[PDB]
C-alpha cells in the first residue's frame, strides 16, 4: 500500500502512463501470441 506507491509508482508514473502506451499494446499482442502458442501444444 505504502512505499509501493511511493518508491515504485511515483517515479514510474511518467513512463507507465505516457511513454509506454504502445509498449502496453505490444505486450497485449505478445500475450495473445504466447497464449495461442501454448494452446496449440
Partner 1 sequence: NLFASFIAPTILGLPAAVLIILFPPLLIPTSKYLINNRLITTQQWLIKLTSKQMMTMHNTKGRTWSLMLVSLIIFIATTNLLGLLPHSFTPTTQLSMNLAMAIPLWAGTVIMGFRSKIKNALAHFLPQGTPTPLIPMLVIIETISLLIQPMALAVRLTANITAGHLLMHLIGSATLAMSTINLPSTLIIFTILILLTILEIAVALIQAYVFTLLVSLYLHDNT
Partner 2 sequence: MPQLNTTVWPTMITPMLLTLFLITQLKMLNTNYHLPPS
Partner 3 sequence: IPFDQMTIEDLNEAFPETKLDKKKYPYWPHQPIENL
Q: Using CB distances below 5 to 8 A depending on partner kind, what does residue 33 bind out of partner 3, partner 2, partner 1, none?
A: partner 1
**Minimum CB–partner distance for residue 9 and partner 3 (Å):** 16
Distance CA 4, CA 17 (A): 17
Smallest gap from residue 41 Cβ to partner 2 (A): 5
Rounded distance between C-alpha atoms, residue 4 and residue 21, angstroms: 21
Binding string, residues 6-35; x marks residues near partner 3 by CB under 8 A: --------xx---x----------------
Whole-number Å distance between alpha carbons of 12 and 4: 11
Amino acid at each position: 500500500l505504502q512505499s509501493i506507491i511511493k518508491n515504485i509508482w511515483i517515479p514510474m508514473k511518467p513512463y507507465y502512463t505516457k511513454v509506454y502506451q504502445e509498449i502496453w499494446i505490444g505486450m497485449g499482442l505478445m500475450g495473445f501470441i504466447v497464449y495461442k502458442i501454448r494452446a496449440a501444444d
